[PDB]
Structure formats: C-alpha cells, structure tokens
C-alpha cells in the first residue's frame, strides 16, 4: 500500500505534453482538449500538473508564447518550441528511445 | 548530450530490472551496461538514492547476500507491496502509450 509517486505522474504528463509540442504550434486549450479527448478512459489528466509543466517550460525558455492576432481582448495564446526548446525536446525523445532499446535488449537477454 | 539520464529514465530501468528479481547495485549497472552495448552507465549514487526512497515506503527491502569470493553484496528486492506499486507504475506508463496511440490516430 504505497502509492505511485508524484514524480512519475509529472513525468508522464511531461511526456504527453512534449509529444504534442513536437507536432507543432498550438494554442493552450487546443493542446489540453486534444490530451483530454485522448486520455478519456485511460488516465485522469491533472490539469494542475499540466499547467505547472507548461509554465516551467516557458520560464526555462523551452516554449515561447505569441498572439494569433494583434487586437487585444479575446485572443488564444499560442505556444511554440524555441530554438533551445526544439533541441531539448529532441534530446528528450532520443534519450527515451535509448531507454526503450535497452529494455528491449534486457527482455531479449532474459529470454535467452 | 547531458551528463545524466533523467531520474524518470533511471527509475524506469531500475524498476524493470528489479521486477526480474533480487539484485545488487554493481550487478544492475553491469546488466544495463551490457544491454546498452557499453553505452549507458547508470549512476551508482542515484541508484542508492532511489533504493533509500523506495525502502522508506516498504517497496524495496534489502539483505546481505550469500558470500561470493570472500564477501557479501547488499541485495535489494521488491516486496509484495513493492510488486504492487511496480505493477501500477508500469500500468500507468502503458496508459501513456495508449494515449499517444489515440493522439496519433486522432481517436
């Protein structure tokens, strides 16, 4: 009776958000709506966890925001990976790919 | 490329290894080095750190192993509640994979 850790739930939310960011520019609710629809029945999205990660990536210069137009009031905030954020994200998926391969190799060693 | 793997990556690998049975820190490092063709050397201090955190909540226990070549290693094992935790850990990550498939398919 030891619950799975908060750090893991954050890591999984991080993975999903980064995967969505990898697909291209988007508005925040656009991301959220896509994740909720895909998550329904699989995982309860913690909106606060998602928000926290979003804000951290922005503060860290991995994503930057812009407006879809220049008329104040009622706009959707869009976000894109920056120069360094693209690099960070590519490293993130590459490093997880290396893990995936190690697990496959461990599985194959175990079965030998 | 950063000096260390992400904690979540080290945890994933450690939990996969321990799912297979009891092990000691050098042994886990050696098996993961082998499985990576020498390319991934997990951080021994990180492993000890993770084990201390898991032992705190009863997920892992430890003991001094059978003597080999003049001494004993400190083995770690998942307990019964630890295998439960581990199953829920891997299940949650399986759900991530399903979510990604749903995003890919737009369904």
Author numbering:
A (entry chain A): 1 to 112
B (entry chain B): 4 to 110
What do the authors of the reporting publication say about this deposited model?
In previous work, we have introduced pAF into lactococcal multidrug resistance regulator (LmrR), a small homodimeric protein harbouring a pore that exhibits promiscuous substrate binding capabilities, either by direct incorporation using the dedicated orthogonal translation system (OTS),19 or, preferably, by introduction of p-azidophenylalanine (pAzF), followed by a post-translational Staudinger reduction. X-ray crystal structures of the parent and evolved designer enzymes suggest that the introduced mutations cause a narrowing of the active site and a reorientation of the catalytic –NH2 group. Position V15 resides inside the pore of LmrR, and is the same position of ncAA incorporation as used in earlier works featuring pAF as catalytic residue.
In a following round of evolution, SSM libraries of two additional positions in the neighbourhood of the ncAA, i.e. M8 and N19, were prepared using V15aY_RNY as template (S8†). Several variants from both SSM libraries performed better than the parent, of which mutant V15aY_RNY_N19W (RNYW) showed the largest improvements, giving 98% yield and 93% ee when used as purified protein. Remarkably, while V15aY exhibits the characteristic LmrR structure, forming an open pore at its dimeric interface of similar shape and dimensions as observed in other LmrR structures, the V15aY_RNYW_KK structure appears to be more closed and exhibits a narrowed cavity. Furthermore, a significant difference in the rotameric state of the aY side chain is observed (S11†). In contrast, in the evolved variant it is placed closer to the pore centre, directed more towards the central tryptophans. The narrowing of the dimeric interface in the evolved variant can be directly linked to the RNYW mutations, which enhance side chain packing between the α1 and α4 helices. The enhanced packing is stabilized through a combination of hydrophobic interactions, aromatic stacking, and hydrogen bonds. Moreover, the close proximity of D100 to the aY residue suggests a potential interaction between the carboxylic residue and the substrates, similar to what has been proposed for V15pAF_RGN.
